[PDB]
Design a protein around this motif. Sequence first.
Motif, PDB file in Angstrom:
ATOM      1  N   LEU A 135     -60.441 -15.723 -86.258  1.00 12.99           N
ATOM      2  CA  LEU A 135     -61.908 -16.886 -85.926  1.00 12.99           C
ATOM      3  C   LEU A 135     -61.100 -17.999 -84.554  1.00 12.99           C
ATOM      4  O   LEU A 135     -62.302 -18.027 -84.120  1.00 12.99           O
ATOM      5  CB  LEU A 135     -61.744 -17.077 -87.692  1.00 12.99           C
ATOM      6  CG  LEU A 135     -62.629 -16.181 -88.519  1.00 12.99           C
ATOM      7  CD1 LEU A 135     -63.481 -17.154 -89.853  1.00 12.99           C
ATOM      8  CD2 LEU A 135     -64.464 -15.448 -88.329  1.00 12.99           C
ATOM      9  N   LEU A 136     -59.881 -18.185 -84.862  1.00 12.72           N
ATOM     10  CA  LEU A 136     -59.531 -19.253 -83.972  1.00 12.72           C
ATOM     11  C   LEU A 136     -59.218 -18.797 -83.339  1.00 12.72           C
ATOM     12  O   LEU A 136     -58.466 -20.283 -82.162  1.00 12.72           O
ATOM     13  CB  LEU A 136     -58.741 -19.897 -85.258  1.00 12.72           C
ATOM     14  CG  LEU A 136     -58.718 -20.694 -86.737  1.00 12.72           C
ATOM     15  CD1 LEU A 136     -57.517 -20.636 -87.072  1.00 12.72           C
ATOM     16  CD2 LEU A 136     -59.958 -21.166 -86.405  1.00 12.72           C
ATOM     17  N   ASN A 137     -59.132 -17.723 -82.714  1.00 10.12           N
ATOM     18  CA  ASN A 137     -57.958 -17.275 -81.805  1.00 10.12           C
ATOM     19  C   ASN A 137     -59.663 -15.884 -80.665  1.00 10.12           C
ATOM     20  O   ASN A 137     -58.130 -15.530 -79.305  1.00 10.12           O
ATOM     21  CB  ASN A 137     -56.456 -16.158 -81.721  1.00 10.12           C
ATOM     22  CG  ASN A 137     -57.261 -15.030 -82.288  1.00 10.12           C
ATOM     23  OD1 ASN A 137     -58.840 -14.469 -82.111  1.00 10.12           O
ATOM     24  ND2 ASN A 137     -56.239 -13.762 -82.336  1.00 10.12           N
ATOM     25  N   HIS A 138     -59.984 -16.113 -80.652  1.00 10.45           N
ATOM     26  CA  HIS A 138     -61.306 -16.056 -79.844  1.00 10.45           C
ATOM     27  C   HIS A 138     -61.046 -14.369 -79.326  1.00 10.45           C
ATOM     28  O   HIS A 138     -61.541 -13.494 -78.327  1.00 10.45           O
ATOM     29  CB  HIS A 138     -61.179 -16.573 -78.765  1.00 10.45           C
ATOM     30  CG  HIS A 138     -61.297 -18.180 -78.166  1.00 10.45           C
ATOM     31  ND1 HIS A 138     -62.619 -18.734 -78.877  1.00 10.45           N
ATOM     32  CD2 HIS A 138     -60.302 -18.958 -78.408  1.00 10.45           C
ATOM     33  CE1 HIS A 138     -62.360 -20.306 -78.412  1.00 10.45           C
ATOM     34  NE2 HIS A 138     -61.280 -20.175 -78.669  1.00 10.45           N
ATOM     35  N   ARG A 139     -60.278 -13.754 -80.283  1.00 13.74           N
ATOM     36  CA  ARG A 139     -60.503 -12.110 -80.164  1.00 13.74           C
ATOM     37  C   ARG A 139     -60.819 -11.125 -81.521  1.00 13.74           C
ATOM     38  O   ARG A 139     -60.886 -10.229 -81.342  1.00 13.74           O
ATOM     39  CB  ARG A 139     -58.588 -12.402 -80.156  1.00 13.74           C
ATOM     40  CG  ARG A 139     -57.911 -12.017 -78.677  1.00 13.74           C
ATOM     41  CD  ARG A 139     -56.834 -12.354 -78.395  1.00 13.74           C
ATOM     42  NE  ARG A 139     -56.093 -12.138 -76.968  1.00 13.74           N
ATOM     43  CZ  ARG A 139     -56.226 -11.756 -76.545  1.00 13.74           C
ATOM     44  NH1 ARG A 139     -55.906 -10.025 -76.888  1.00 13.74           N
ATOM     45  NH2 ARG A 139     -55.704 -12.021 -75.749  1.00 13.74           N
ATOM     46  N   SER A 140     -61.735 -11.885 -81.972  1.00 11.82           N
ATOM     47  CA  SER A 140     -62.839 -11.561 -83.153  1.00 11.82           C
ATOM     48  C   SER A 140     -63.464 -10.516 -82.569  1.00 11.82           C
ATOM     49  O   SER A 140     -64.180  -9.574 -83.198  1.00 11.82           O
ATOM     50  CB  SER A 140     -63.617 -12.767 -83.739  1.00 11.82           C
ATOM     51  OG  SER A 140     -64.575 -13.075 -82.755  1.00 11.82           O
ATOM     52  N   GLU A 196     -65.350  -4.911 -80.596  1.00 13.80           N
ATOM     53  CA  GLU A 196     -64.870  -4.800 -81.700  1.00 13.80           C
ATOM     54  C   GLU A 196     -63.363  -5.717 -81.875  1.00 13.80           C
ATOM     55  O   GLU A 196     -63.003  -6.202 -80.784  1.00 13.80           O
ATOM     56  CB  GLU A 196     -63.291  -3.343 -81.398  1.00 13.80           C
ATOM     57  CG  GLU A 196     -64.517  -2.460 -80.892  1.00 13.80           C
ATOM     58  CD  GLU A 196     -65.488  -1.492 -82.407  1.00 13.80           C
ATOM     59  OE1 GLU A 196     -64.785  -1.641 -83.660  1.00 13.80           O
ATOM     60  OE2 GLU A 196     -66.375  -1.660 -81.881  1.00 13.80           O
ATOM     61  N   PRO A 197     -63.407  -5.920 -83.237  1.00 13.14           N
ATOM     62  CA  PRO A 197     -61.923  -7.719 -83.651  1.00 13.14           C
ATOM     63  C   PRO A 197     -60.633  -6.921 -81.949  1.00 13.14           C
ATOM     64  O   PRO A 197     -60.446  -5.915 -82.197  1.00 13.14           O
ATOM     65  CB  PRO A 197     -61.666  -6.730 -84.920  1.00 13.14           C
ATOM     66  CG  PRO A 197     -62.869  -6.589 -85.913  1.00 13.14           C
ATOM     67  CD  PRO A 197     -63.831  -5.791 -84.301  1.00 13.14           C
ATOM     68  N   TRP A 198     -60.029  -7.607 -81.512  1.00 10.75           N
ATOM     69  CA  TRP A 198     -58.279  -7.533 -80.393  1.00 10.75           C
ATOM     70  C   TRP A 198     -59.526  -6.447 -79.902  1.00 10.75           C
ATOM     71  O   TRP A 198     -58.185  -6.666 -78.842  1.00 10.75           O
ATOM     72  CB  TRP A 198     -57.808  -7.481 -81.606  1.00 10.75           C
ATOM     73  CG  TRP A 198     -57.408  -7.346 -82.780  1.00 10.75           C
ATOM     74  CD1 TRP A 198     -57.547  -7.453 -84.431  1.00 10.75           C
ATOM     75  CD2 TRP A 198     -57.035  -8.448 -82.993  1.00 10.75           C
ATOM     76  NE1 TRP A 198     -56.984  -7.472 -84.819  1.00 10.75           N
ATOM     77  CE2 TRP A 198     -56.435  -9.200 -84.558  1.00 10.75           C
ATOM     78  CE3 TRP A 198     -56.004  -9.385 -82.093  1.00 10.75           C
ATOM     79  CZ2 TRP A 198     -55.858 -10.262 -84.786  1.00 10.75           C
ATOM     80  CZ3 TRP A 198     -55.642 -10.281 -82.490  1.00 10.75           C
ATOM     81  CH2 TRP A 198     -55.113 -10.963 -83.809  1.00 10.75           C
ATOM     82  N   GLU A 200     -62.591 -13.120 -75.397  1.00 17.65           N
ATOM     83  CA  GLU A 200     -63.710 -13.377 -75.199  1.00 17.65           C
ATOM     84  C   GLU A 200     -63.947 -14.572 -75.965  1.00 17.65           C
ATOM     85  O   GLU A 200     -63.903 -14.784 -76.652  1.00 17.65           O
ATOM     86  CB  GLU A 200     -64.612 -12.304 -75.084  1.00 17.65           C
ATOM     87  CG  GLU A 200     -66.192 -13.168 -74.081  1.00 17.65           C
ATOM     88  CD  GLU A 200     -67.326 -11.418 -74.100  1.00 17.65           C
ATOM     89  OE1 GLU A 200     -68.235 -11.985 -73.948  1.00 17.65           O
ATOM     90  OE2 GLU A 200     -67.327 -10.849 -74.547  1.00 17.65           O
ATOM     91  N   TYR A 201     -63.868 -15.452 -75.121  1.00 22.63           N
ATOM     92  CA  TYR A 201     -64.117 -17.200 -75.913  1.00 22.63           C
ATOM     93  C   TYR A 201     -65.138 -17.209 -77.239  1.00 22.63           C
ATOM     94  O   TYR A 201     -66.413 -16.618 -76.897  1.00 22.63           O
ATOM     95  CB  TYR A 201     -64.657 -17.921 -74.496  1.00 22.63           C
ATOM     96  CG  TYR A 201     -64.441 -19.965 -75.346  1.00 22.63           C
ATOM     97  CD1 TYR A 201     -63.417 -20.751 -75.614  1.00 22.63           C
ATOM     98  CD2 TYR A 201     -65.898 -20.368 -75.727  1.00 22.63           C
ATOM     99  CE1 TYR A 201     -62.937 -21.608 -75.972  1.00 22.63           C
ATOM    100  CE2 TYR A 201     -65.680 -21.450 -76.799  1.00 22.63           C
ATOM    101  CZ  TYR A 201     -64.358 -22.330 -76.713  1.00 22.63           C
ATOM    102  OH  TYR A 201     -65.046 -23.561 -76.596  1.00 22.63           O
ATOM    103  N   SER A 202     -65.025 -17.863 -78.221  1.00 24.52           N
ATOM    104  CA  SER A 202     -66.340 -17.394 -79.126  1.00 24.52           C
ATOM    105  C   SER A 202     -66.080 -18.778 -80.491  1.00 24.52           C
ATOM    106  O   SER A 202     -65.101 -19.452 -81.264  1.00 24.52           O
ATOM    107  CB  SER A 202     -65.280 -16.067 -80.605  1.00 24.52           C
ATOM    108  OG  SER A 202     -66.566 -16.237 -81.301  1.00 24.52           O
ATOM    109  N   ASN A 203     -67.194 -18.784 -80.510  1.00 25.02           N
ATOM    110  CA  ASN A 203     -68.435 -20.032 -80.756  1.00 25.02           C
ATOM    111  C   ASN A 203     -68.015 -19.568 -82.490  1.00 25.02           C
ATOM    112  O   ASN A 203     -67.950 -19.757 -83.195  1.00 25.02           O
ATOM    113  CB  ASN A 203     -69.329 -20.526 -80.419  1.00 25.02           C
ATOM    114  CG  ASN A 203     -69.137 -21.533 -78.488  1.00 25.02           C
ATOM    115  OD1 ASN A 203     -68.796 -22.072 -78.470  1.00 25.02           O
ATOM    116  ND2 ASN A 203     -69.208 -20.599 -77.675  1.00 25.02           N
ATOM    117  N   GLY A 261     -53.701 -20.447 -78.947  1.00 22.03           N
ATOM    118  CA  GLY A 261     -53.303 -20.114 -79.709  1.00 22.03           C
ATOM    119  C   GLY A 261     -54.386 -19.549 -81.182  1.00 22.03           C
ATOM    120  O   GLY A 261     -55.507 -19.574 -80.525  1.00 22.03           O
ATOM    121  N   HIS A 262     -54.210 -20.573 -81.535  1.00 21.76           N
ATOM    122  CA  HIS A 262     -54.783 -20.226 -83.095  1.00 21.76           C
ATOM    123  C   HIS A 262     -55.854 -21.796 -83.044  1.00 21.76           C
ATOM    124  O   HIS A 262     -55.363 -23.051 -84.414  1.00 21.76           O
ATOM    125  CB  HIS A 262     -54.691 -20.412 -84.722  1.00 21.76           C
ATOM    126  CG  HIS A 262     -54.215 -18.598 -84.446  1.00 21.76           C
ATOM    127  ND1 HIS A 262     -52.912 -18.412 -83.761  1.00 21.76           N
ATOM    128  CD2 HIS A 262     -54.980 -17.482 -84.504  1.00 21.76           C
ATOM    129  CE1 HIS A 262     -52.357 -17.000 -83.709  1.00 21.76           C
ATOM    130  NE2 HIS A 262     -53.885 -16.702 -84.765  1.00 21.76           N
TER     131      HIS A 262
END
Length: 362
Positions: A102-107, A141-143, A147-150, A290-291
């Motif tokens: 949720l914090l690392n932009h790879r969700s 897909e997760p990971w 890609e920047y995620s709000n 990071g996170h």
Amino acid sequence: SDLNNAIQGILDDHVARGVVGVSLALCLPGEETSLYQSGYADKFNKMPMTGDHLFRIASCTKSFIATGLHLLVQDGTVDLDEPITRWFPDLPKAAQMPVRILLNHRSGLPDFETSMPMISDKSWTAQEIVDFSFRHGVQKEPWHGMEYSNTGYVLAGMIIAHETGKPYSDHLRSRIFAPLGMKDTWVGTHETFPIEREARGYMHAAADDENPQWDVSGAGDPVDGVWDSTEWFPLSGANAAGDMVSTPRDIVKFLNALFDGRILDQKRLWEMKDNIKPAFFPGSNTVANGHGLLLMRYGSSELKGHLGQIPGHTSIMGRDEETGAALMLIQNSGAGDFESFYLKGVNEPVDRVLEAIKNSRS
Ligand SMILES: [Ba+2]
Ligand SMILES: [Ba+2]
Ligand SMILES: [Ba+2]
Ligand SMILES: [Ba+2]
């Protein structure tokens, strides 16, 4: 000092490029925080920018929401590696989503920001934004990659609320702003802030605003080359992804304490700043994240912090771990396009400041 004059000159040069105003706080090892401003808080009234003017810090909010979450990990109620199905059982792909993604932009979460109407009076709900994201965004897909995620941060805010039984503003205030004496900081979704104290934000009718990142229909005509975009967009719409209002002074307070180990314990601090992978943000200097923290490279210096873009207010915060410096620079000029000078060019005075510090230290 020579440094003072160099920095003031850098800020003066930047507003002379056509930026309306700029407000900087810089703390150096062994020194108090110094504040610097140039240009105007209000273009049309010609009010001088001061260190007391409030700004929308946009995505710099993400560092505070991360901090909030990492604190709930410290409380022992949240595990960074556990699936978010606990809070969002019906969210598509939630089982493959640990808290940390949720914090690392790879969700791979679908995003809302490029679809959300910017000029509206709509009071947004967090769930509504998540719903809106799945309706209009594209899920990966997760990971999959970075890609920047709000959306990930809006979800992080929802965990904070659920685990504290209260709005996330309460947790951030009681656990961050209050203990650090941050008196000019508000969480826009759940708190009223003094609008009259806020620097005006300006969107520029610039030629390089070719590929706008926001739906800015309903703007009307530009006056003197700009739109006043201060109160265009509901902060409730940005939510835990970018709803905060603050001053450079207050932001440097937070940054000093965070990197001095006075907020997060050593493991959670490490998660935020050192457990990193590559990261991209268009037009920016970002190289990793990071996170809750972005790593942004400025030649031979690097900030660990965040960037922020909300119509008219453009912000760069961070700590240089090498030199120990902490800064927050915010201008009240922006545009829509990531590659516009009025957006990406905020990195230029930041770059100059860091090299002035370096030269004062040689
Ligand atoms: Ba176009
Ligand atoms: Ba409005
Ligand atoms: Ba170096
Ligand atoms: Ba020198």
